[PDB]
Design a protein around this ligand. Structure first.
Ligand SMILES: [Cl-]
Length: 91
């Protein structure tokens, strides 16, 4: 999908189960590092575009990305982390 941008495009790099696991990691971590929480029901049901917007709405843009990239590295989606980094760097 060359139609999509930003965080949403990355969440679309995740398959069905990965996305499902992504949401479980997100909720764990937000709890672990003690941020204001999103209701687990909202998180669980969210589409990729909706979750991307939930993240940015609750944590603003930079933190939504940093949180998302931490989860990727944790889920063994290190390719996504390096991809974003090669881009943001100019490599
Ligand atoms: Cl899906």
């Amino acid at each position: 999908f060359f139609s999509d941008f930003g965080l949403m495009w990355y969440l679309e790099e995740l398959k069905k189960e990965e996305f499902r696991k992504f949401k479980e990691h997100l909720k764990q971590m937000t709890l672990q590092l003690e941020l204001k929480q999103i209701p687990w029901t909202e998180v669980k049901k969210a589409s990729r575009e909706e979750l991307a917007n939930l993240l940015i709405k609750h944590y603003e843009e930079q933190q939504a990305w940093n949180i998302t990239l931490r989860i990727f590295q944790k889920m063994d989606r290190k390719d996504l982390c390096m991809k974003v980094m090669r881009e943001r760097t100019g490599y």
